[PDB]
Write a protein that binds this DNA or RNA. Structure first.
Ligand SMILES: Nc1ncnc2c1ncn2[C@@H]1O[C@H](COP(=O)(O)O)[C@@H](O)[C@H]1O
Length: 529
RNA sequence: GGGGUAUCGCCAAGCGGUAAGGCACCGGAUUCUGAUUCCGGCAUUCCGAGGUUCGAAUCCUCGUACCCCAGCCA
């Protein structure tokens, strides 16, 4: 439970409401991101818990920043997280003729006027946080003139910025938002839904409360910066003929450590090509987290864990990662792949290679097993051989024996070095009856797999508070390796997370993989203690 | 000037009757993955100071810190 649900239980109990109707209203100017997923879980989760409804409304009031590419991706990510909206997809532009009719009501009541103060001047007249504002010389025009001027606006007779419609409230209110907030501005820009029917567009504050009213939203939930704005929400609805009055409630937004959530900044990363695009596995977008190998059930668990409060907060990645780890430890079929490979040849090996049965899940027999090829020339990962090492080290030192995963206890006998003191092969004996572990891949039957080792995109915990967050990108955000994997990984479907034993959970990247050359993204690494 | 918020390293419950829970961290058991599982350890004290009470993180002062607002953006 959280404060919002306690409000909703009060409301039901008092008979204030009989059904709850919430809504998620993303503006289509970018891809959704883990912050948004907190709002999706909240809004759609309350709806299904209370057997209520939840609407998806595209808050498309600003044409010059929005594009149709984002409306289809947003529907796509909302469904992928596992949620569905009530009825049809709604759009603020559905209400464009309705909002205009309401603007005329406000004009006819003398509670709104066409102002002609330039964009610079309205700021000059607005006052400051300590000094009250002052009235526009245009504030007292006749209802009759305001109607005449607003239709001249609607019919594009005024240039952009040369006129706007404003609410007539109080230029000395301590709420800066109530100092005659603009209701309409002129934008000669094609809107991705209404084409060029309109060249006056409504501002967010006017649109938002009338839309919620029209859809019968019982509780508009949004983030803490809209607390002052609630005053204009209630003022608009108290001054127009509307039969209902939704209440707005605010919870704090999500801040994840080591990433930037503003869509203006994410957009710059994509635009200036510092990431592949919105769904790059380093992006904190929902589609990026999907390509990285996250599961919609892991993000719903994240939502569950981070709480819903009024407290400002920054969650450590350790929480996000904890969630995906728990999911994938349960559900990921195990496999073997070597990321940095050095050859290990068993000289004692008699034969052309056998087959060992490997479990698909070490603690869950139910997930079955597979036959993996064993051989004399295997591949091992570099860090698993040390020529000299102290007792803590339980991998292959040149003096002792290690078990190969699900195969033989081998015993280190002789290294062969590359001229630059590097080593090139290790020579070992194997005990024929032996069934400190290391993973391995039969060189003979190995599949070449590209591996993308992903790391946090930024090197500072709060890259947003930096004078230029771009200069604080982590250059090792992605390091591409070429390794080898057991041939069963030939049947990996994109978006099925494997646990590469003693490395991390990895998933195929449909965007780069092909046949013969797969590309595996590392979702997350194992808890290296 | 106005609107908000203070409980563990990060998050969070608590609604006058004696500080939950999760992540991270530190042990120690068990493991053919330095993983997983188990077991245990994690806030005499709740931003500070003062007052009410039998009893205060909860109530009442009076401070202090931080967040948010001056887009014709949302
Ligand atoms: N970081 C965030 N954490 C939680 N909710 C958010 C966050 N960013 C945006 N939202 C919510 O997402 C919805 C649409 O936001 P927007 O994408 O700015 O139009 C609103 O409910 C916002 O309050």
């Amino acid at each position: 439970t959280n404060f919002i649900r306690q409000i909703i239980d009060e409301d039901l109990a008092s008979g204030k409401h009989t059904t709850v109707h919430t809504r998620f209203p993303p503006e289509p100017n970018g891809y959704l991101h883990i912050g948004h997923a907190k709002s999706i879980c909240l809004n759609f989760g309350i709806a299904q818990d209370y057997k209520g409804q939840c609407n998806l409304r595209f808050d498309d009031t600003n044409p010059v920043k929005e594009d149709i590419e984002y409306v289809e991706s947003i529907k796509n990510d909302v469904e992928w997280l596992g949620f569905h909206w009530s009825g049809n997809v709604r759009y603020s532009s559905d209400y464009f003729d309705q909002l205009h009719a309401y603007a005329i009501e406000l004009i006819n009541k003398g509670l709104a006027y066409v102002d002609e103060l330039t964009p610079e001047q309205i700021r000059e007249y607005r006052g400051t946080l300590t000094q009250p504002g002052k009235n526009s010389p245009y504030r007292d025009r006749s209802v009759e003139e305001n109607l005449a001027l607003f239709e001249k606006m609607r019919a594009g007779g005024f240039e952009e910025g040369k006129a706007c419609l404003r609410a007539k409230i109080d230029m000395a209110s301590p709420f800066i938002v109530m100092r005659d907030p603009v209701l309409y501005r002129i934008k000669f820009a094609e809107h991705h839904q209404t084409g060029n029917k309109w060249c006056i567009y409504p501002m967010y504050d006017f649109t938002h409360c009338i839309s919620d009213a029209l859809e019968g939203i019982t509780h508009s939930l949004c983030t803490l910066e809209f607390q002052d704005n609630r005053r204009l929400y209630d003022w608009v609805l108290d001054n127009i003929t509307i039969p209902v009055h939704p209440r707005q409630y605010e919870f704090s937004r999500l801040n994840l450590e080591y990433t930037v959530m503003s869509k203006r900044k994410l957009n710059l990363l994509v635009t200036d090509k510092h990431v592949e695009g919105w769904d790059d596995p380093r992006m904190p977008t929902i589609s990026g987290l999907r390509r990285r190998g996250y599961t919609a059930a892991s993000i719903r668990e994240f939502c569950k864990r981070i709480g819903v409060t009024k407290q400002d907060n920054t969650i450590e990645m350790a929480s996000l990662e904890s969630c995906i780890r728990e999911d994938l430890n349960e559900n990921a079929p195990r496999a073997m792949a070597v990321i940095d490979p050095v050859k290990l040849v068993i000289e004692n090996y008699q034969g052309e290679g056998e087959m060992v049965t490997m479990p698909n899940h070490p603690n869950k027999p139910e997930m079955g097993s597979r036959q993996v090829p064993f051989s004399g020339e295997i591949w091992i990962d570099r860090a698993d051989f040390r020529e000299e090492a102290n007792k803590q080290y339980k991998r292959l030192v040149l003096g002792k024996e290690v078990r190969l995963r699900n195969a033989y206890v081998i015993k280190a006998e002789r290294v062969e070095k590359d001229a630059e003191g590097n080593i090139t092969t290790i020579f070992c004996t194997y005990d024929a009856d032996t069934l400190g572990v290391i993973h391995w891949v039969s060189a003979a039957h190995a599949l070449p797999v590209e591996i993308r080792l992903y790391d946090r995109l930024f090197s500072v915990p709060n890259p947003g508070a930096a004078d230029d967050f771009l200069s604080v990108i982590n250059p090792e955000s992605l390091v591409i390796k070429q390794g080898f994997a057991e041939p069963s990984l030939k049947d990996a479907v994109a978006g099925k997370a494997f646990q590469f034993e003693r490395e991390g959970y990895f998933c195929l990247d449909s965007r780069h993989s092909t046949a013969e050359k797969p590309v595996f993204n590392r979702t997350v690494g194992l808890r290296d203690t």
